[PDB]
UniProtKB/Swiss-Prot annotation, chains A, B:
It is linked to A chromosomal aberration involving IL2 is found in a form of T-cell acute lymphoblastic leukemia (T-ALL). Translocation t(4;16)(q26;p13) with involves TNFRSF17. GO terms for molecular function: carbohydrate binding; cytokine activity; glycosphingolipid binding; growth factor activity; interleukin-2 receptor binding; kappa-type opioid receptor binding; kinase activator activity. Keywords: Adaptive immunity, Chromosomal rearrangement, Cytokine, Disulfide bond, Glycoprotein, Growth factor, Immunity, Pharmaceutical, Proto-oncogene, Secreted, Signal. Disulfide bonds join C53-C93. Belongs to the IL-2 family. It is found in: Secreted. It comes from Homo sapiens (Human). Cytokine produced by activated CD4-positive helper T-cells and to a lesser extend activated CD8-positive T-cells and natural killer (NK) cells that plays pivotal roles in the immune response and tolerance. Binds to a receptor complex composed of either the high-affinity trimeric IL-2R (IL2RA/CD25, IL2RB/CD122 and IL2RG/CD132) or the low-affinity dimeric IL-2R (IL2RB and IL2RG). Interaction with the receptor leads to oligomerization and conformation changes in the IL-2R subunits resulting in downstream signaling starting with phosphorylation of JAK1 and JAK3. One of its GO terms (biological process) is cell adhesion. GO terms for cellular component: extracellular region; extracellular space. It comes from the Eukaryota. The keyword Nucleus does not apply. This is Interleukin-2.
Length: 121, 121
């Protein structure tokens, strides 16, 4: 339904961009260690059904976000992870060989969120 | 006056038990998954200024309620959330380390409203 689904994808998107602005900065002194954690990436991520691949990596994502300073995030991280967990459960794995960093992993799902929206427009 | 406070607090308590009833029942097939969402508890909730620690958890509570099957609620979840909000505003945060589930969370607040009411009669 162009509006329930795009309304949730643009809300998924902003929760993810808000997690990335939180870790990604000079006021974040453990960025370098966060950068060494392994995140798995979806081989394919062409449909919403593929959100299972993001769903599966959400508790790795929460464990490593514990290294981040609550303060530079726009929403309490806890809220950001709950919000994304409710939207994926309400919207929805073949992983790729080479693993990725938290910044490549967030960036890759921001890109899939923007991609489906552009089909729904 | 004390009757106005008595009256907004008896009202919070029923809005709080009505949410517990919509969640806590067998016609709600999302119960086990909603029990994995984490909620912060206050270190102590002894007075009305401590309603700050409920005000803050309200937008996670609304979002997780999106997983509940709306027909099990006596009044629309939205209504329940709006009433709890204008009453916490009319009426009033040291959290605690162990997190809690939506059922323990709604329950420690149901006890707090029940204990304040008893103090006024």
């Amino acid at each position: 339904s162009t509006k329930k689904t795009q309304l949730q994808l643009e809300h998924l998107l902003l929760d993810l961009q808000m997690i990335l602005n939180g870790i990604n900065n000079y006021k974040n002194p453990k960025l370098t260690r966060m950068l060494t954690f392994k995140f798995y990436m979806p081989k394919k991520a062409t449909e919403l059904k593929h959100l299972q691949c993001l769903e599966e990596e959400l508790k790795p994502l929460e464990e490593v976000l514990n290294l981040a300073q609550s303060k530079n995030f726009h929403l309490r991280p806890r809220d950001l992870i709950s919000n994304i967990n409710v939207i994926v459960l309400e919207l929805k794995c073949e992983y790729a060989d080479e693993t990725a960093t938290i910044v490549e992993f967030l960036n890759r799902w921001i890109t899939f969120a923007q991609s489906i929206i552009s089909t729904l427009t």
